[PDB]
Design an enzyme around this catalytic site. Structure first.
Site, PDB file in Angstrom:
ATOM      1  N   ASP A 140       7.527  39.141  49.046  1.00 29.27           N
ATOM      2  CA  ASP A 140       6.987  39.827  50.204  1.00 29.27           C
ATOM      3  C   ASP A 140       7.983  39.720  51.395  1.00 29.27           C
ATOM      4  O   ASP A 140       9.128  40.128  51.198  1.00 29.27           O
ATOM      5  CB  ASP A 140       5.548  39.342  50.475  1.00 29.27           C
ATOM      6  N   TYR A 176       6.429  41.128  61.719  1.00 28.16           N
ATOM      7  CA  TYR A 176       6.244  42.583  61.765  1.00 28.16           C
ATOM      8  C   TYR A 176       6.589  43.207  63.109  1.00 28.16           C
ATOM      9  O   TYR A 176       6.584  44.430  63.204  1.00 28.16           O
ATOM     10  CB  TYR A 176       4.774  42.926  61.552  1.00 28.16           C
ATOM     11  N   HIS A 227      -0.353  42.232  44.162  1.00 27.79           N
ATOM     12  CA  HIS A 227       0.518  41.755  45.229  1.00 27.79           C
ATOM     13  C   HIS A 227       0.837  40.258  45.185  1.00 27.79           C
ATOM     14  O   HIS A 227       1.962  39.875  45.469  1.00 27.79           O
ATOM     15  CB  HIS A 227      -0.041  42.129  46.618  1.00 27.79           C
TER      16      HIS A 227
END
Lengths: 546, 546
Positions: free
Chosen positions: B334, B465, B523
């Protein structure tokens, strides 16, 4: 008044200069003079090499562009390149040969010690070759000795563009007049000089150092051999392992390769190995320097029986299990040395090699208690003083600064008599209240130990001496065994407690035992003769434990 | 009602039995039947072998005593020993051949899971051979799966002396009726049986397991393949490195060999690699599983720009410098996967090999901001919701138990729609307040994450982010480069955010790229398909990074 010194890497801190290998390659291959140097600079600011130094492309992307440049240059010179011509082979060998220019690094370390800020400003590339580890190791050894490392390929600028010198002065927070700049390439000095920097053209190291001496006013050449690199505790990786519900062990870790466990003595710390930790890691070993049970950041339970050898050795085995290490080389000093001989005797499968500084292996006597054996030697009277719980603690904790300044001294600076300690009433009853600082340690180093002993106290450390009968009973189980794994005994000439003569019969129990001897060395071996300890340990590790 | 199971090592947990090698040696060397077995038992309780098993002498001291025993036995049998006869060569090969009897270890693990206390009771020796590391590694792999390991040479007692069985029952705190005892040697069962223990004579594993099933009432044979060994956080070595004044990184460490750095994603922990850490260490690697910056025990500064890729990668390089590692294999998942591609692009010299789980390498687009690129994909709408400081934090920190139970689910158990997150007003606005526990995790595993996120919160994690434009600007410097070091991309079929199709053009930038693909995997790759991840990583490490 100069306050910063900037060094180039190639041709200044590392020799031979990778740029000079092209000259020797042309001679060896009978190629036209300057042919390879032309292919290297082909294109100027827009050429493959400038893009390599700016970080636009990596070294492996540049190799085929330099190869084409070599062919285009040879066609104009009306010559043919050999059958076995390879830019990769030439550059692999050139990068591999480059070693640290020791006198230049020593001069940079001296300037930094005298208050100067030091930096490396170099035109370098992003190395992605299968052999890139060699460059990475070199960069790591140099990195720790400089305040800044500015690499062209990371900032996107190259020497001699004036912007890299402005970026340098910005990083250094200094005016060009306060900066010395050393480079082997004339063209790279012009911009530093235009700004007003003091520049030194480095052709040979000794002349460059004479110029550096003349301009800084500091003696750099003909200066004594420096002490080994030491540890800054706040820069170390600190590890913590719980070996049993109330017991956690702290250790410091550095390096990669075979595990080497360092075990300190009384009343010490992992910090006693400060000169060995960087040297042993640089030799290719993963160093784990412990705070033994009862010390520093390791747990210090008050119970006496928590410090008998059997319990201590068992926890050391659990330490290896929790870290996932099937074996480690065990190196001990003083009480730590006593422990590593018992690790070899009881857990040989977990011990790759065993080394002891000062502490000899003396087998248990089944016909005599260790208590009666301690009466026979008057120098071991201090051990009877350490028996009664509370007595030696009160004296040693009374003033910690005095305790460590009185203990940590060179053999000729001694202020303590180890005889009639019990009759005198204490260890420090005939000692000055404010002892002078020994030449062996700094006030900052002494303060690290007082900080460590402020939290723990001396109870845990002194309990190592309060299990004589239990240790004797346990040791008697190993009387039929021999130590048949790689072993090293290092004696210290001036240790008047652990005298070299106490180790004379060790070959009867460890027949293939190797020896080391340090002259004019007292009890505190690691900090008394650090360079000699490092040399003896690295030599032995590389042959017996590798 | 049985509550404890005791296993022997030789002939029960490890095969072939070292005692059975003497039978096959006599056959191969055409020696009289039982000659080597007689030399082995020569003397009974006073013989060399009993002293070896009691710990009186070490294995290397015993070899010449067994050699003499072989010669004395041959003289009575009227035979001559071969020219190349060596007890050391026979025992070296026998110990080396012995592997773990997997079905027996699996049955012991099942019994321990069902509440049984398990122990190994074995007659073993102090191994001081130059090859002793092989035994040490075997003992370590078995050790972690048992409550107790009682070795004859450590307690000074041997099977079949009745005192070792009394010592066993004392250690187990159980009555002989609650103990199952498994041994391959008949003589060793007699004392356990005399005390009233349930005994199983192990000749072949499957019959011994059928007997064990019948007597315990638990299915051991024909049972499903178990999950890989996981980590207990309190049994790990925890490391702490200060990389800059306000920034400290925590990591967990296990094993020896080449350094492998594991980098988790959002919103995770080092604990997300719990199934990989023991497997990778057992494969011969030193595993460092990080708490990335902003998570768990690592520092979490509030500033957004403290989490841009450039700063993050630079701190990872400093992490390697402070540990004394010139290189590490970097494995990410990730956001951690995004970071390891940039470590390969900017610091190839420090990266031995690069592997990414789910996260593809997508090169920066200089003609388009990453913000406009995020509008083009409706599944990436959740990234626009994460931009405004404070908004996503309030929702994710509101009820931590709900946050992790809603996120950590298998692909078919999903409860979240990643589309119109902004329009809906939140991530969990259409989700149950009390989600069911996913089949992928336990309540105890979920609680580890809530404990970790109670201290930190989501600010540091969400800031990863909030640097899209800064990361884009920095990535644009690497557009002329290629990744030419060993690289692995692992895709997860059912990851509906990081879909396998996003990695289809990676070969243009990493031409020698290797691939892995996991079907029916969402995921959370590491905890969804742990066995498959371990197999793909160990296969790749052994070939490309070794």
């Amino acid at each position: 008044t100069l306050r910063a010194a900037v060094f180039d890497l190639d041709g200044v801190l590392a020799l031979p200069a990778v740029f000079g290998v092209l000259g020797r390659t042309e001679e060896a291959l009978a190629l036209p003079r300057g042919l390879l140097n032309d292919a290297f600079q082909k294109g100027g600011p827009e050429g493959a090499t400038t893009r390599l130094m700016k970080g636009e492309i990596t070294l492996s992307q540049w190799i085929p562009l330099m190869e084409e440049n070599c062919r285009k240059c040879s066609e104009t010179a009306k010559v043919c390149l050999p059958k076995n011509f390879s830019i990769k082979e030439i550059f692999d060998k050139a990068i591999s040969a480059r070693k640290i220019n020791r006198p230049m690094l020593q001069a940079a370390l001296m300037l930094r010690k005298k208050g100067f800020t030091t930096a490396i400003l170099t035109n370098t590339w992003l190395d992605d070759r299968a052999e890139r580890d060699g460059l990475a190791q070199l960069m790591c050894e140099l990195k720790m000795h400089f305040d800044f490392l500015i690499e062209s390929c990371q900032v996107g600028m190259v020497k001699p563009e004036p912007q890299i010198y402005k970026f340098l002065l910005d990083t250094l927070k200094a005016s060009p007049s306060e900066v010395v700049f050393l480079d082997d390439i004339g063209a790279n000095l012009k911009p530093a000089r235009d700004l007003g920097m003091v520049t030194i053209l480095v052709q040979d190291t000794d002349t460059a150092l004479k110029e550096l001496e003349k301009v800084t006013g500091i003696q750099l050449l003909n200066t004594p051999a420096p002490l080994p690199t030491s540890c800054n505790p706040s820069d170390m990786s600190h590890g913590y392992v719980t070996v049993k519900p109330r017991v956690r062990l702290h250790f410091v870790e550095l390096g990669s390769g075979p595990a080497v466990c360092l075990c300190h003595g009384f009343p010490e710390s992992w910090y006693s190995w400060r000169y060995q930790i960087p040297a042993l890691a640089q030799a290719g070993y993963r160093v784990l320097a412990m705070d033994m049970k009862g010390y520093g950041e390791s747990s210090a339970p008050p119970e006496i029986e928590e410090y008998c050898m059997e319990v201590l050795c068992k926890e050391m085995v659990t330490f290896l299990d929790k870290l996932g290490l099937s074996q480690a080389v065990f190196i001990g000093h003083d009480w730590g040395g006593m422990l590593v001989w018992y690790m070899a005797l009881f857990y040989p499968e977990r011990v790759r090699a065993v080394a002891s500084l000062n502490t000899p292996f003396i087998p248990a006597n089944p016909n005599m208690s260790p208590l009666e054996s301690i009466k026979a030697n008057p120098v071991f009277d201090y051990q009877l003083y350490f028996q009664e719980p509370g007595v030696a603690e009160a004296e040693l904790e009374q003033n910690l600064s005095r305790t460590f300044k009185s203990l940590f001294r060179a053999s000729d600076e001694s202020v303590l008599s180890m005889h009639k300690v019990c009759e005198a009433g204490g260890l420090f009853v005939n000692s000055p209240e404010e002892p002078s600082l020994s030449r062996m340690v700094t006030e900052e180093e002494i303060q690290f130990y007082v900080q460590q002993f402020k939290k723990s106290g001396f109870r845990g450390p002194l309990n190592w001496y309060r299990n004589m009968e239990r240790n004797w009973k346990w040791a008697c189980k190993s009387l039929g065994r021999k130590i048949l794994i790689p072993a090293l005994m290092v004696t210290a000439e001036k240790d008047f407690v652990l005298v070299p003569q106490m180790s004379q019969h060790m070959e009867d129990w460890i027949p293939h035992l190797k020896r080391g001897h340090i002259e004019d060395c007292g009890h505190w071996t690691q900090m008394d003769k650090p360079t000699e300890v490092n040399q003896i340990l690295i030599k032995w590790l590389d042959s017996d434990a590798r």
